[PDB]
């Protein structure tokens, strides 16, 4: 349905602003929360065979500080993205000075593309997602406790105070949905604040492995 | 000879007295005279009005706020220690001015604060209320009606309002109309004394007697034991034995075969007491409690006596020519006795195939109003029992069809039928499946639709409106009720009905109501009629 | 409004102050506004704690497990000192407030002056401190309990000692204890605990089988069920449901 | 119509107090608002949430692996706590 | 489950209930025999609740000797109708269905499992909490 | 006091009531009255409050004025500065100023006083603005203090900068307060004042101006934005390379203009934190080039940009400075010699002297980085070059390096540093003498220099005629 598609795209964009803002990229409140009718007026309400369609609403956002690093998203028209298309996206970024970008695929994306992204990760980091997984925020869920990335300066004296090495810390897998949402790389620390029925608030510390 | 003051000119009256004869060391007098060190605060307050002129609200709201602040300050610094002396010494310039200008709530608040002190102030307030064209519209307090004039005037106004309103007013102002009369039993007896005289006359005596009925009903649960007093007011006091027996009966609040035997003996005689003694609703209610209860079986030794007593109470007539009865009828009490006995045996047998089989004869018996509302009460007691719904074919169609028959055969029973049905609908019955409960509520709404069809329409629609507004039940029930209602209504449409039914119609997913009507538009026609009417 | 009326300890009403506290106490309280300011500060902190508790317990359940039973100790102390709360109290609210603050500093869970250690300390006893502050609020303290100052400080000492005892000792083999104390109730439980119902109810299949399939996380469980909530008027309406 | 690996679905109003939603009235009291809820026999999460009118906050499953695949590890730890507590205290036996 | 487990065996439970019935009356010789076995006993007989016409003690008096130290507790009997507390007489139970102990003395209430056994917050639990486990041991022994 | 219509009427009534009869009742009636106040309430007040003070009415009026200010804010938010609401607020403020000499008037002006035609007249009337100058952020804050308050703040800013420099030898709130009255004209005036202060200080004010601009951009910011972002990236990453590349690209993609590029370069260069960051980046680039063995190349571009920024302050309307590619090889030659010496140890002097004689911020930074057989030979050459340079910033960097060496705790290096610090204290001002005394406080860990160090400090206390030398000598004597 055309209305179903436009609604889905509106939700996708909404989740994307929420993701970026949580990640730490400056975004204006208007985009952070805008009405479905507002987006429909913006884009035509006819994604199917209409002036709105994929790659039209791709947005570029810079970090809150140090505007050198900026990130934008790719919206392949085809369901299963092509390796040639990802290479074209890479070249588009090459024209840009920013090495960070995201991709949203309607369908599963090729394992060859997976390997390609892994190979070109070091020079520039490109991350992919899927419609259904991004269709609803995960952080919103009550079951999910509060998550915060950590920094080197804080991790250092944290380890010093607790007289333990990073390995001893309880671990979390890198490819988990939460670590993917936060774009956390290996060897990075995340603190979790949770409501405990028996002590009110509990703090836990985790390492992305 | 001081000339030391910035805004103390207002207190110049006391300043002159403290200065002309200051003498000694007038340090305190000088301090009082120069106490208003601020600027002309009265002028500042006046200019506050000018500022509000250009402000958001250049209206009398500021004046009302200032008056409220002054009243609150007076209440806070009320001279309760010497309030009586202050009110009763002069009483000339303060009470008169307050009644003339600030009589809105100042006097009422002062009276209601304690009401013990300031006897002169209370008397002045009562006099002002009496002088006011609107009888004591300010002094509406349950503990402030301890004065003959104020209480009688307020009671007269309340009675006039109730009579002007009518049946629709029988429920809203009655509780607050009774809260003061029942506050003191001396006041209650005085009201009953005047009210019996009012009822003596033929015209309006029925209404006055009815008002007495609901008033004594309220007093009963309020805690009054004035059954003997009511009997004294009634003609039953003419017979000391009858009055004593009936007073004991009412005080016990049950039925005693030993005393009812005496009542039967003195009844069905050549000179029966004036039926007004047995026409009191309270004794009939005691009869209802004792007789038609699903349980509580009686020894039945005097079963015929109870049946005959009920038939005599609800059937016989008399012609009070100059307060003298010379023409009475007793040809219908026999049929009444037969029907009531049949219904009593139906209640006693406590069984369902035979109940359905005799249902046809019960329909004939319903034509007696007493039998109909006895069936109503027994059905209420049976249904209200928790877990009464365990086996159902059409959600207990028997009892609900009995209610429909009662409503059709007797229009005056509609308020009580609605009360029972709405109580049942409000009640949530657990131990049942959700779908079953939903269907049960739909069945209840079917009886709502029947009551509406029987002309008891405005209260039904009003209750539906109220239930939608507060404690929102599932929208499905409201939709279903509206769909059924639209079927039974055809033009013409009363304007008041259209107004009552309108707001629920144009909200809460209107389009969902129309699914496959096709032949006749359910809500489109009503909308067109409403547009034409308004 | 009820919390306000129950914990404000308003001082404007002179008669209530006379009934509760002595003449010297009421006169000093009315004279010193700073005491009133601190009382207002305590009330605001209690309001914030009330909001925090309405956050932490979404359920409307007030049943919680705490290392101390303040009401029982208050009861014991009252009859120990023969308070006879009919008479007005003889202690000022300032001692109550300072003593509760001092106790809040006395009880320790996380040691160290490190900011990370500091955050952890108050987080650990966050709930217990809220409970003790709510119970020992000056309003209830002076009104419903009416302890003397000696009873008050003795009670504070008792709380200190009891919370000292409640500390979990180091070196206790606690993982084994926890798992094994899970075992005994499992033994008590039986697969027949469920007597079924007229409605299928999704066949929860609670009991030892459920615990089994949970302990060894199973890819395919017997009755994988999903609970679903609707948003608004769609849920309100059965038809939309 | 519908999704796969999902058989007949039940609907009911939660009698139990914990399940039914609670609203903080302006006066401060919690009020328990009974409301329709659904139970599906064949669990397929992240596809129910994709649909319309589905609450993403209150939804929870009874399995473990499915929620693990979609909500990290803290989510499953908490949900496992919830379920195990439910089972062990169904009989009224309280465990610390 | 942070509860007491030693509880009270079935037989002594029924015996203590029938003993602490609200109307139990006992003779001088029987009381003088019973008090012997209380290990923690001070050695001074308590005043009877009834003196004239005859000296007649009460099992609650006897049990107050058993209860050690000075403890305060409230518990609801198993047969306690809840509406009683809602209505009047909430401090004088017609059925003595409110368990009330003050300063190591049983004031009014029939002891049952809900006030003695493994029920959480029970008299045994509070005794252990307040006094020494040795005190609680002597308490159990004397009860039995 | 204030004499509005009502004030003048009250004054006239008071003057006329001093004589000519004027009985009490007539005077009370003719003085003034409260239209809102009811006669019944007025009559009852004497019998209850015993001539109660009208201060309750004044408090109620103050509360009503606060509510009116809130209503004006609500109207400006819903009506978006509605013309009628603005006119009513202006009329009310004028009336309040005329009547009371004015807390409600000041509050109303602050809440809503934009584009007020009578705002200039009101400000002129409140020329003193003892409290109003700060209370009226709309006018006093918005260009009110530009004429004199801006200069006063600049003087306090200079004092704060001097105090910070003195403390380092041994702010944000003010900038936020200044920027609170943020408008187009306010920003232009602030920029002009900052440029004037930087010109007067000869570079000192440039760092403060750049920091203030960066803070304003970061918090409620709104080529300036690009410059602020580049500066923030450089500050966040001392050795960052992507940020440096982005900044270089932005600078290259800057069209030639009248004083714009000059101001950007001056702001970049005149920043002690910025200078330190540039020096650290250059040192890191040189180390990377040495490791890669690819000596000559973004390091050359970075060095050229740093030199242009440093030389921009010489004169206005400047484009850039010569790259000096040929001289780059000679400059890097000492680094290659030092690296070769270090490699030989783990397995010159003339150039250092020439560099020290030549004035080069890059040379000073390289010497500081180096301080932070072949190595021994290079060290004397570095010392000679630093002595030849003899700059104040070079002395500060040498003090930092001496602190680092003291942390390293080198015995022979300790004696060499003691001699160098003595020479630097003798040559430099009281600040240099105090720094040398502080270093010597922990210096002389060996007993063979401790008495000598004490004697040298005692001699320098007298030799340093400035009070700083005497203070340092007294502190050293007290310590030991």
Numbering used by the authors:
A (entry chain 4): 2 to 210
B (entry chain g): 51 to 401, 404 to 586
C (entry chain 1): 914 to 1154
D (entry chain 1): 1299 to 1394
E (entry chain 1): 530 to 673
F (entry chain f): 4 to 104, 109 to 177, 199 to 250, 259 to 332, 338 to 388, 408 to 432, 439 to 546
Question: What is the paper's account of this structure, in its own sentences?
Answer:
To investigate the mechanistic implications of INTAC in promoter-proximal pausing, the INTAC-PEC complex was assembled using purified human INTAC, NELF, DSIF, S. scrofa Pol II, and a DNA–RNA scaffold. The cryo-EM map was refined to 4.2 Å resolution and the maps of subcomplexes were improved to near-atomic (3.5–3.8 Å) resolution by focused refinement. Structural comparison shows that the phosphatase and endonuclease modules of INTAC are more separated in INTAC-PEC to fit the binding of PEC. A previously undetected tail module extends out of the bottom of the backbone module and folds back to bind Pol II. The PEC complex sits above the main body of INTAC through interface-I/-II/-V and is further stabilized by two INTAC protrusions on opposite sides at interface-III/-IV. Cryo-EM map reveals four putative Pol II CTD segments, indicative of a potential CTD-binding path toward the active center of PP2A-C for dephosphorylation. The result agrees with previous study showing that Integrator binds both Pol IInonphos and Pol IIphos. The above structural and biochemical results suggest that multiple CTD-binding sites on INTAC may facilitate anchoring CTD repeats and recruiting nearby phosphorylated CTD to PP2A-C for persistent dephosphorylation. At the interface-V, the SPT5 KOWx-4 domain contacts the INTS11 metallo-β-lactamase domain, which bridges the RNA exit tunnel of Pol II and RNA entry tunnel of INTS11. Superposition of INTS11 metallo-β-lactamase domain shows that the association of RNA-bound PEC induces a rotation of INTS11 β-CASP domain by ~15°C and an opening of the substrate-binding tunnel by ~6 Å, permitting the entry of the RNA for cleavage. Thus, the nucleotide above INTS11 active site in the INTAC-PEC structure might be derived from nucleotide −23, because the following nucleotides (−22 to −1) would not extend to this position. The above structural and biochemical results suggest that INTAC-PEC paves an RNA path from Pol II active site to the catalytic site of INTS11 to permit cleavage of nascent RNA into a product about 23-nt or 24-nt.
Pol II forms a paused elongation complex (PEC) through binding of two transcriptional regulation factors DSIF and NELF. Integrator complex functions as an RNA endonuclease to cleave different classes of RNAs. More recent studies discovered that Integrator is enriched in the proximity of gene promoters and can associate with paused Pol II bound by DSIF and NELF to trigger PTT and repress gene activity. We have recently found that Integrator associates with protein phosphatase 2A core enzyme (PP2A-AC) and dephosphorylates the C-terminal domain (CTD) of Pol II and determined the structure of Integrator-containing PP2A-AC (termed INTAC), showing how the RNA endonuclease and protein phosphatase are organized in the INTAC complex.
